[PDB]
Amino acid sequence: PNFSGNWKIIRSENFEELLKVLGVNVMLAAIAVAAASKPAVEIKQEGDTFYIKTSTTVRTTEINFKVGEEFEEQTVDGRPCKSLVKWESENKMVCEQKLLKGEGPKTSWTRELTNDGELILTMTADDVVCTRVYVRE
Amino acid sequence: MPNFSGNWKIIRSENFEELLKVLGVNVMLAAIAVAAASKPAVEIKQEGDTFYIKTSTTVRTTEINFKVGEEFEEQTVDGRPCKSLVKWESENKMVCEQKLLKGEGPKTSWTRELTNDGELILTMTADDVVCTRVYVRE
Amino acid sequence: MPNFSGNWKIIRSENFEELLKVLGVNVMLAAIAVAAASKPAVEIKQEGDTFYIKTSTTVRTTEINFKVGEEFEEQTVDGRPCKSLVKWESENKMVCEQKLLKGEGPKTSWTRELTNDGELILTMTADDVVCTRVYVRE
Amino acid sequence: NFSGNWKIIRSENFEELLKVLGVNVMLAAIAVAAASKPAVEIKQEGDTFYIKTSTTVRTTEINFKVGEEFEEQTVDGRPCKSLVKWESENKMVCEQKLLKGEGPKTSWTRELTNDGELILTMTADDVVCTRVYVRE
Numbered sequence: 356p357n358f359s360g361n362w363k364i365i366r367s368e369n370f371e372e373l374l375k376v377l378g379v380n381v382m383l384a385a386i387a388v389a390a391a392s393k394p395a396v397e398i399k400q401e402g403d404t405f406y407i408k409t410s411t412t413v414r415t416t417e418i419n420f421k422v423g424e425e426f427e428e429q430t431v432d433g434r435p436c437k438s439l440v441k442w443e444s445e446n447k448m449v450c451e452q453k454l455l456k457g458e459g460p461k462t463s464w465t466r467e468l469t470n471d472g473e474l475i476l477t478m479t480a481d482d483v484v485c486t487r488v489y490v491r492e
Numbered sequence: 493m494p495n496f497s498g499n500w501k502i503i504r505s506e507n508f509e510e511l512l513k514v515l516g517v518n519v520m521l522a523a524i525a526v527a528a529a530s531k532p533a534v535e536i537k538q539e540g541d542t543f544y545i546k547t548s549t550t551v552r553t554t555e556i557n558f559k560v561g562e563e564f565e566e567q568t569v570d571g572r573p574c575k576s577l578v579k580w581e582s583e584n585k586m587v588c589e590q591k592l593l594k595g596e597g598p599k600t601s602w603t604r605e606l607t608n609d610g611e612l613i614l615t616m617t618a619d620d621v622v623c624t625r626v627y628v629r630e
Numbered sequence: 631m632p633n634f635s636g637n638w639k640i641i642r643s644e645n646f647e648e649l650l651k652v653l654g655v656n657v658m659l660a661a662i663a664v665a666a667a668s669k670p671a672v673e674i675k676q677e678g679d680t681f682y683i684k685t686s687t688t689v690r691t692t693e694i695n696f697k698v699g700e701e702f703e704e705q706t707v708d709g710r711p712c713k714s715l716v717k718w719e720s721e722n723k724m725v726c727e728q729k730l731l732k733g734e735g736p737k738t739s740w741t742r743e744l745t746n747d748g749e750l751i752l753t754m755t756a757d758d759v760v761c762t763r764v765y766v767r768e
Numbered sequence: 769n770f771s772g773n774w775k776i777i778r779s780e781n782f783e784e785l786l787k788v789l790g791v792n793v794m795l796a797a798i799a800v801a802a803a804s805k806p807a808v809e810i811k812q813e814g815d816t817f818y819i820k821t822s823t824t825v826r827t828t829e830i831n832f833k834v835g836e837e838f839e840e841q842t843v844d845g846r847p848c849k850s851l852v853k854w855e856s857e858n859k860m861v862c863e864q865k866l867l868k869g870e871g872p873k874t875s876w877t878r879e880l881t882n883d884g885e886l887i888l889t890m891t892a893d894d895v896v897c898t899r900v901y902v903r904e
């Protein structure tokens with residue numbers, strides 16, 4: 356007998372530890388919120404300081420930042436990043452993100468208040484854009 | 493007549509997140525992130541038949557509490573709400589039968605045993621299939 | 631009496647993949663990899679009421695076929711096996727009702743429409759909630 | 769002013785973003801590796817191997833010769849170059865190098881035991897998962 360055969364599994368040991376090292380848990384958690392949940396958003400703007408609370412069935416996310424001051428958040432796929440928001444125009448902010456660890460597409464986001472009373476969030480990865488459009492409750 | 497034949501390229505995809513949320517895909521993904529993809533650490537406080545279990549992972553800390561012999565609500569490993577009832581099988585082993593609050597699925601259960609060697613054994617069952625987790629005290 | 635109290639550290643986790651398979655978690659993850667997380671390209675061949683639809687993504691190429699007015703088996707958008715029946719709503723629009731082969735869930739359906747502007751519109755519904763995808767020819 | 773309670777009306781093209789991010793690759797790979805019970809067919813012809821891993825969601829086929837670089841995927845679906853060597857008469861070891869990007873150092877081993885078992889190990893940065901098989 357050599358390796359040739361039809362093999363059936365009797366034991367699978369410690370896969371959760373391997374998935375944890377690979378960051379799969381962080382990706383799953385993040386996509387559960389971002390891709391698979393309908394969000395509701397609460398913003399408190401005090402000058403150029405922002406509180407943004409994103410509520411979903413599975414997670415409530417709160418970020419706090421001041422325009423022009425570096426802060427930490429997660430990318431849309433859950434990776435920790437340093438973020439810096441700047442005004443692009445009077446009604447549009449742009450956030451550049453840098454990964455704390457590893458490599459990946461260049462990610463960013465924008466938030467704009469439109470003339471039609473809408474809030475527009477864009478999220479970019481290497482020039483591919485996702486758009487979310489919100490109206491006041 | 494209209495001919496759907498072609499090589500089609502996508503220009504827009506709208507509101508998929510709403511569809512996945514009605515389908516419960518968010519709840520399942522979140523639950524699998526914790527159960528399948530995270531190394532857990534477990535804190536138990538037992539006072540007689542009353543249990544507090546805190547399960548810590550990178551992505552979630554879960555706290556449950558129950559009394560042996562009293563129905564309570566928890567979630568299945570895939571995140572479905574269930575009614576649970578724990579009974580002693582023996583002095584050192586508790587068994588939990590689960591019933592879904594909504595819908596149908598595999599029969600699920602769990603057991604927790606404290607061995608004579610001071611190991612904690614969790615089993616989780618779905619129909620014919622059993623998963624085992626073994627823990628030691630820090 | 632046995633005391634389960636402690637700070638427990640995991641040493642072994644055995645056979646979780648079996649449990650996830652019985653729970654259908656694999657089928658959900660595979661389906662969401664394609665539907666939620668991939669940009670699709672779609673090839674259609676229509677021969678009267680018979681359709682061949684090939685969906686190409688980074689992770690999978692899928693082929694389905696059906697005949698309008700004949701019950702067939704496919705998967706829901708979240709991967710659950712279903713019985714499907716497509717009917718013409720108009721010359722330009724087909725509508726598909728789905729029924730799960732096992733278990734319960736939101737009522738799912740899809741429609742495919744060819745517009746006068748040469749667009750293909752896919753809608754997917756679950757209970758009150760609609761996702762729309764729009765395609766043009768290459 | 770951005771202050772308010774905002775309700776979503778449209779979410780557009782998230783699938784395109786997730787595809788750029790490789791989330792599809794990771795989901796597909798874990799559907800097979802973590803969430804499926806595998807069945808494995810091996811054909812060993814000299815030191816040439818065909819390994820077919822069958823699951824509910826995917827059948828995967830690799831072909832390699834011991835000592836010759838080939839391409840496969842890591843456990844989380846990333847394309848890699850692989851090289852298998854004999855560590856011992858009954859145990860092969862495979863080192864992997866990502867084609868693109870950065871990640872944990874990954875490897876796998878396959879062993880035939882004297883008790884008739886097949887043992888697969890898969891490692892990422894010194895964290896090991898083990899699969900044990902017997903002949904059908």
Ligand code: NA
Pocket residue numbers: none
């Ligand atoms: Na100002």
Ligand code: NA
Pocket residue numbers: 502503
């Ligand atoms: Na486009």
Ligand code: NA
Pocket residue numbers: 672752
């Ligand atoms: Na389509």
Ligand code: NA
Pocket residue numbers: 505506507508509666780781782783784
């Ligand atoms: Na989408």
